[PDB]
């Protein structure tokens, strides 16, 4: 998994608090990650890794994975991407 | 290997269609574009809007 692909996947999940994928390992491009050439397999196997550490919670239904960031995920991706502490996911900014 | 990993054609036949719920390849209902298998349609028929009248 190229480091550019890994960074692209991680900093897209950060803007929201959610991620969606289809259980299709032969799909050549993830629709949310077009023009970056990130396959659908890489997203699946990256969210598999982030779940095992406890930073995200998943839900599966009808060929679809729905992942959510946990409080330990914002704390962990803020140091991985060296983001300013003045960055918060779109889920955390309303109401 | 990249040339030949998923390189058999999958344009037609049962090996190119599957259930939209359970991904099974046997007993699929293509009519109206249901795309649900024989046994998953009996489970969600009322939710879709099908009624047993006669």
């Amino acid at each position: 998994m190229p480091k550019k692909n890994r960074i692209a996947i991680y900093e897209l999940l950060f803007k929201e608090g959610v991620m969606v994928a289809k259980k299709d390992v032969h799909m050549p491009k993830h629709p949310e990650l077009a023009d970056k050439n990130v396959p659908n397999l890489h997203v699946m196997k990256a969210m598999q890794s982030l779940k095992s550490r406890g930073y995200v919670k998943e839900q599966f239904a009808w060929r679809h994975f729905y992942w959510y960031l946990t409080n330990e995920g914002i704390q962990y991706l803020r140091d991985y991407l060296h983001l300013p502490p003045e960055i918060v996911p779109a889920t955390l900014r309303r109401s | 290997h990249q040339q030949l990993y998923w390189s058999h054609p999958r344009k037609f036949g049962q090996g190119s269609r599957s259930c939209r719920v359970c991904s099974n390849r046997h007993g699929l209902i293509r009519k109206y574009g249901l795309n649900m298998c024989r046994q998953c349609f009996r489970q969600y028929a009322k939710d879709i809007g099908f009624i047993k009248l006669d």
């Binding site: - | 009996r42 809007g49 099908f50 009624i51 047993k52």
Partner: protein, 100 residues
């Protein structure tokens, strides 16, 4: 100038209530209307084997869905058109408007 309103539903009671409300409102204002014409009912049929394994006495489920259609014609400006439709809202009814 001609305004065609197409209604389509699966519950004929609700659909007829909506159509009657629209016709009555158009009569209430100063409009000329062409009455509700009923297109033939659409009957969709799925027949399935009841069993999941092909063992028993070969019984079949007969499933079906029914779609009801209407058409209404008006001769009025769109400003006048877009009040009565917004008043009456009902679930399951697919209201469509076409200007000539």
């Amino acid at each position: 100038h001609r305004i065609r309103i197409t209604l389509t539903s699966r519950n004929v009671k609700s659909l007829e209530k909506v159509c009657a409300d629209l016709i009555r409102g158009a009569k209430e204002k100063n409009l000329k209307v062409k009455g509700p014409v009923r297109m033939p009912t659409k009957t969709l049929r799925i027949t399935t084997r009841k069993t999941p394994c092909g063992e028993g006495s070969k019984t079949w489920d007969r499933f079906q869905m029914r779609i009801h259609k209407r058409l209404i014609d008006l001769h009025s400006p769109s400003e006048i058109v877009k009040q009565i439709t917004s008043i009456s809202i009902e679930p399951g009814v697919e209201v469509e408007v076409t200007i000539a």
